[PDB]
Amino acid sequence: KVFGRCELAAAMKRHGLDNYRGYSLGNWVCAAKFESNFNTQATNRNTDGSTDYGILQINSRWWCNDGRTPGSRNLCNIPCSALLSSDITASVNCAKKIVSDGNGMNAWVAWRNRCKGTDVQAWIRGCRL
């Protein structure tokens, strides 16, 4: 799936991401834009032999089981294919575990480079929900 901006904002609002651990909804939409281009099937292979999956590009070395990444954890307790579903439930559920760690949203590099400290409010403006 490729989500529309306001389609995704409504979706993540319903999943309770607005102000989750002090991060306004705008930063979740911004993160998704620069991580995946709102593409729910997005995948990225890194040279180290892990893979980043889905709408939020969650990493296989720590968060999900891929069956292909050596010496790995799956802290979100999922198969990594679940992060490629058209429904964002699994990705939001795992991301909530990520931002609860102490590093916060700095876990996502695209957030860190293109969203952090900007007017993230712009990413939910012109939407109903």
Known catalytic residues are: 35, 52
SS3 sequence of the chain: CECCHHHHHHHHHHCCCCCECCECHHHHHHHHHHHHCCECCCEEECCCCCEEECCCCEECCCCCECCCCCCCCCCCCCEHHHHHCCCCHHHHHHHHHHHCCCCHHHHCHHHHHHCCCCCHHHHHCCCCC
Place of tokens 């990444």: 69
101 marked among binding-site residues? yes
Sign of CA dihedral 48, 112, 64, 75: positive
Residues making up the annotated binding site are: 101
Residues making up the annotated binding site for substrate are: 101
